[PDB]
Amino acid sequence: SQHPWKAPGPNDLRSPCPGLNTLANHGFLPRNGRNITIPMIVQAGFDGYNVQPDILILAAKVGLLTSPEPDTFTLDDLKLHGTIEHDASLSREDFALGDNLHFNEAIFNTLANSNPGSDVYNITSAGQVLKDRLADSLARNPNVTNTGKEFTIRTLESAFYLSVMGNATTGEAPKNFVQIFFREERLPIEEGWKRSTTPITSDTLNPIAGQISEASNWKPNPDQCPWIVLSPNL
Amino acid sequence: SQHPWKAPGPNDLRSPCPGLNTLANHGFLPRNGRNITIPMIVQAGFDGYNVQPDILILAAKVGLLTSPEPDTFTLDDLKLHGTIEHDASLSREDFALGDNLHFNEAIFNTLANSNPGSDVYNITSAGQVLKDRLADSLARNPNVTNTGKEFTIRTLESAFYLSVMGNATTGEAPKNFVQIFFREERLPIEEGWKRSTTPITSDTLNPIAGQISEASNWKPNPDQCPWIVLSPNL
Ligand code: HEM
Ligand code: HEM
Ligand SMILES: *[C@@H]1O[C@H](CO)[C@@H](O[C@@H]2O[C@H](CO)[C@@H](O)[C@H](O)[C@H]2NC(C)=O)[C@H](O)[C@H]1NC(C)=O
Ligand SMILES: *[C@@H]1O[C@H](CO)[C@@H](O[C@@H]2O[C@H](CO)[C@@H](O)[C@H](O)[C@H]2NC(C)=O)[C@H](O)[C@H]1NC(C)=O
Ligand SMILES: *[C@@H]1O[C@H](CO)[C@@H](O)[C@H](O)[C@H]1NC(C)=O
Ligand SMILES: *[C@@H]1O[C@H](CO)[C@@H](O)[C@H](O)[C@H]1NC(C)=O
Ligand SMILES: [Mg+2]
Ligand SMILES: [Mg+2]
């Protein structure tokens, strides 16, 4: 109740990440999306979601590469293509095709309509979505980057939405909570969402991501070396 | 005079980097080599050497990957092979062959004896040293990693010793200052070394590194993708 949802205003920077954006929209991260340090990310992920430090620390260290500042980033910086941001997102367009930053319903339609006839999204549907989103990028984006780096991140992001909106042990999440999370970047509190009472860790997320990977029918582009883009000055 | 040299004691952690180690040995960085943040690196490089932030910030952000902590590293963490630490060092052995952390005179002999008959090391001699050190690694290390990432770093490190011990405009450095720097990880103050009165920046270092690269007779291993090792837990 000390962390109400408020829509970002024009000064309030946001990322391509529903996880961080929802934390900002509740004031777990700064509402203005600016001046974010690694400890702020670690604290916010714990307080909002019961996500534990190891995975947040690595992501946040990589995220600092997107920023010219010594030890902060803004949420907008994290759009930098090829650092973390990648093609075949669940809810954003590819950088070469359109807007890699903002929620897009037409892209999200695939995830929205997944697991038809169930009340949850689960590992199986999440892998089908990864398969279909990458096939779309390969069909329409001549510049798609699809290495083990991007695929690993995509499996972890799908494990994240299942775990933070759902059950972090089983990887099942109520569809309506996932929809609100992406579309509104809001914690669905009035709708009955509760913060996980089990810690969400690398040991809970990695097995879910691995099972999603096995359900994705994936292969890498064989000619592309994985890379983390190291600065936005290129 | 408020930054005297003191040898590290057993609790005082050090890196594979003469630049950072010399800063610690003078107390510009903590003498114990522990609890180092990005702003500490930026401040220490400015105060000791007149090195400016951009290049320090990127290096320090990458250095955080070597540490399990949220926003610090120790100097010892920076030994992690394949993050920054690389084969064909000027003064350390390759990880697969021996000690990748401590100064080794037998390795340093090549740099020491370079530019025979001159009172300086310069771009030409620095490129000859890169050539000979990589040839040694290729001859003796079956596991050598030699991509554009490592070669770029090696050219910048050589530009660094020339610039901080010498003239940051020309890339010429008095031999005796460079020798003390590596062998003692000390600023050669009694010997006449003065901090650069011109700022050392990416715009001064990059042209030196580029000329060193052109004098190195380099080629990459064609089968190796450049990579930054992302954690020491692997
Ligand atoms: C706190 C827990 C987090 C959760 C639950 C979370 C969740 C997600 C999800 C589900 C996506 C995929 C969005 C899509 O494909 O449309 C995503 C993307 C992203 N996240 Fe996170 N995230 C979290 C933390 C972080 C952190 C710590 C960073 C970096 C500091 C980060 C940076 C990103 C970026 C840059 C993307 C865009 C990747 C892309 O789709 O192209 N996230 N996140
Ligand atoms: C402050 C200015 C700096 C100078 C003058 C400097 C100088 C050097 C030099 C000359 C080497 C090569 C040593 C050798 O090959 O034997 C080196 C290596 C290294 N430096 Fe720096 N450095 C500086 C800053 C940094 C920073 C900011 C980091 C990271 C936080 C860093 C991390 C390293 C590492 C890990 C190595 C080992 C690479 C290797 O030889 O395998 N240095 N440095
Ligand atoms: C994800 O949810 C789907 C839908 O409920 C599961 O697929 C069903 O599995 C049951 C039991 O095997 C079958 O009787 C149904 O016919 C399946 N339905 C459809 C529509 O495919 C799927 O098993 C779930 N995945 C996981 C990992 O729990
Ligand atoms: C680095 O120093 C060497 C040694 O002084 C320079 O090579 C000399 O260059 C002069 C002028 O061209 C010649 O007369 C000498 O015979 C060269 N000496 C040797 C021993 O090679 C070299 O030019 C310098 N490099 C740079 C970039 O300044
Ligand atoms: C999550 O699923 C696990 C495994 O089935 C179950 O034991 C636990 O009760 C579930 N969590 C909640 C809050 O229902
Ligand atoms: C460094 O070299 C430049 C270019 O020759 C010269 O102008 C400058 O005086 C030198 N610096 C010092 C401190 O001698
Ligand atoms: Mg994307
Ligand atoms: Mg080395």
Residue numbers in the entry:
A (entry chain A), B (entry chain A): 8 to 241
Authors' description from the paper:
Unspecific peroxygenases (UPOs) are a class of heme‐thiolate oxygenases from fungi that have similar catalytic scope to P450s, but are dependent only upon hydrogen peroxide (H2O2) as the external oxidant. A recent survey by Faiza and co‐workers explored the diversity of UPOs within sequence databases and was able to identify two major groups of enzymes: ‘long’ UPOs (Group I), typified by AaeUPO, of approximately 45 kDa molecular weight, and ‘short’ UPOs (Group II), typified by the enzyme from Marasmius rotula (MroUPO), which are of approximately 29 kDa. In this study, we have cloned the gene encoding an ‘artificial’ short UPO (artUPO) close in sequence to MroUPO, and expressed it in both Pichia pastoris and E. coli. In addition to their overall similarities in fold, artUPO, MroUPO and HspUPO feature both a glutamic acid and histidine residue (E164 and H93 in artUPO) that forms the catalytic acid‐base pair, in common with CPO and in contrast to the Glu‐Arg dyad found in AaeUPO.
